[PDB]
Design a protein around this ligand. Sequence first.
Ligand SMILES: [Zn+2]
Ligand SMILES: [Zn+2]
Lengths: 45, 69, 174
Amino acid sequence: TLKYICAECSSKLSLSRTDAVRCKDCGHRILLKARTKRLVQFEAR
Amino acid sequence: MIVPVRCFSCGKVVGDKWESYLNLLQEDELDEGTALSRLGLKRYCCRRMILTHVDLIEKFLRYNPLEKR
Amino acid sequence: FEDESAPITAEDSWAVISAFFREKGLVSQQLDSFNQFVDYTLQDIICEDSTLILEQLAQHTTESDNISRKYEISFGKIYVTKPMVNESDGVTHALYPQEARLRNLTYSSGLFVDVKKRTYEAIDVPGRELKYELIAEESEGKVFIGRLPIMLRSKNCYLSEATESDLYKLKECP
Ligand SMILES: [Zn+2]
Ligand SMILES: [Zn+2]
């Protein structure tokens, strides 16, 4: 499903809607959504 | 943050003279003026670019990465 | 120089100023005031007054039940803990400032006090003075009376004793 990263483990966690928002390695409750896969375009100017 | 690539005023490339500057200040025990003159920065526009730079990137690098692979 | 008692120039005043700012800092008044409040003022506020006496007179219509009660409650020492957070599931864990900032919590520590539940009685003999003696219910046992917000870097904060590396580890700017 959609991926997230723990705030203090950098561990990748795929979670669904029914899942409780926690880290499965340390129990931390702050999660950061993963980087998008679609390309990003920047003007070097 | 990190050393600017080019001098704002004239455009001389000064981004490759930072580590050499730190080495001259550390290894050779040169003062700032002689070190700047040794790197070829003769206009004071470039001398203020290198002389007044504050390298904040190190402080940022002290924190642990958010996404570690 | 060589003379220990040589007079100082105007440049050494900056050494003295550097010493002052090394010891004190720039926000020393805030932390000093809060440390004084937590260390001494809370105890004074708790101990001063805070002795609820309730003298329940006999109100005896008949002489068979002529006994007067007196229930009183006082407060002893106060205990202030380190900042901790109560969770939805009831699990309490230590709370750090760069968690309360993100999760919109309050960086506060619980307060506990030693209640002292005393009481007296008196054999209500009319005319004779109402002598109030002990009924052996000299009871009392900390109770959670609230939470005090803690300022950062104060003596009761997780960052008071933190070093530079520890501050970097806890995602705190030195
Ligand atoms: Zn974790
Ligand atoms: Zn220039």
